[PDB]
Design a protein around this ligand. Sequence first.
Ligand code: MET
Length: 531
Amino acid sequence: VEKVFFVTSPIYYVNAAPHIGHVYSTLITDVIGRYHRVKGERVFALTGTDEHGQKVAEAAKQKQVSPYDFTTAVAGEFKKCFEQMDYSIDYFIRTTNEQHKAVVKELWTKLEQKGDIYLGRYEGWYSISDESFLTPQNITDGVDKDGNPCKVSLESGHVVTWVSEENYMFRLSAFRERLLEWYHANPGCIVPEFRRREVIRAVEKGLPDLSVSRARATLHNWAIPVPGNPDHCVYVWLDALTNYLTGSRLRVDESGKEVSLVDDFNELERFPADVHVIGKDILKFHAIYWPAFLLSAGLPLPKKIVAHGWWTKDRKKISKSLGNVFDPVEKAEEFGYDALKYFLLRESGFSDDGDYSDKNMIARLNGELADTLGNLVMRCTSAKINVNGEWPSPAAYTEEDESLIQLIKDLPGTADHYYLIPDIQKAIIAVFDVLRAINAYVTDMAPWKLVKTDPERLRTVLYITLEGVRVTTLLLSPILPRKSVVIFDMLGVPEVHRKGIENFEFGAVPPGTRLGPAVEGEVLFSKRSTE
Ligand code: MET
């Protein structure tokens, strides 16, 4: 089926300034979208801010300013950050948006008409910081920021409070068997596999009904009113998850502003998400509640949920109060935007909790970007080796020649599979496995020597090198968007050959193509010292 490839990030609470976790999640969303655009697909990538709720309302109250002013300011910080990070997200959604508000009321009414919302009570634990209902098995003893004994979440370590409230309840218990059929019938729907097994195990054990409203006082009236009952507000998470539906129904102008909300999602051909990128901390909301709501409402389910891990810096937790900051904009100015992105996507896989150190960052920048990629690009574009600044016409291929060609022809299929899991780390490793192979080839053939000794042989070696670099670069263009453009300019690849599955083929750029001009000082990635 041909639709718009729809990929999303979580919408982030605006209780505090943006940081690495938000940047990382949105990066993964951005990269997936970028890859599908280079395949020549229609793409709609979505990110944004989650602006209602007790968490955020109380964050605003502690800064002594109104929730409207606070959310608008912090949302502004998120937008600025994401612009500075040079992403290619199609739309930034805010849950305070009036059109989203309308979609939530629609979904609610659908759930009610379906017979799946009833008036009950929740009596149990709740984490305001996570906006999460917790069973007693998921809480333990801890200390509040007074240092007094309290209860905390086993999930997150945040303070938990006991809630006892007449609330509208969603019939999640009724959806156990249908969710289990869904997980088994679609064994690639949750990635990575151990998180899928986690979800199945949790749902096997049984599901309780879920509170989808709260008394209005508790939310400091900072929430969407329940249709037909203005004493209740819609659960922040039902509101929040609905952002994906809203996004699928907004017509956006070229400026990035929303202009119109269509009645039926089929009009825009986005819904359901092909990939929801999330962090492991919000798996239940996306893999259990969300599909339950969609099943109730009669809407189609997402194709994949991919859940990544958390970051540490110098093997310590990230927090400004502890004395260990990791600012992405700061590190990107220092080391480079594409390089920082490369590092975040290369150092850790979605199954892992990654670790940034300036040491390891410099190791990769120098080792892989500079010595593997950059070195190769400069050799095959050098006036020394490539005396005519053109793509030569290859002569006969030796067997060693063809072993390398095979690797280059095989690469796109392999990278494609990894990008589709999605497992960006393995995609990158795959591409650099091929770059390392081209380097060893170039060392072996010593093309600097061939300029004088065997110019016909040099033609062959230089051509293979140019083409392996082109193909590897194309496949890395979602990871290194700005640098890929430089590389292609240096190689003189025409614009048309910088996109499309046609150009995944070995040989798409014809011999005789002229390289772009050299600069006196230029290097792609500059090595950095190890202080
Ligand atoms: C529908 S995704 C909501 C995510 C939530 N706002 C968070 O920051 O964890």
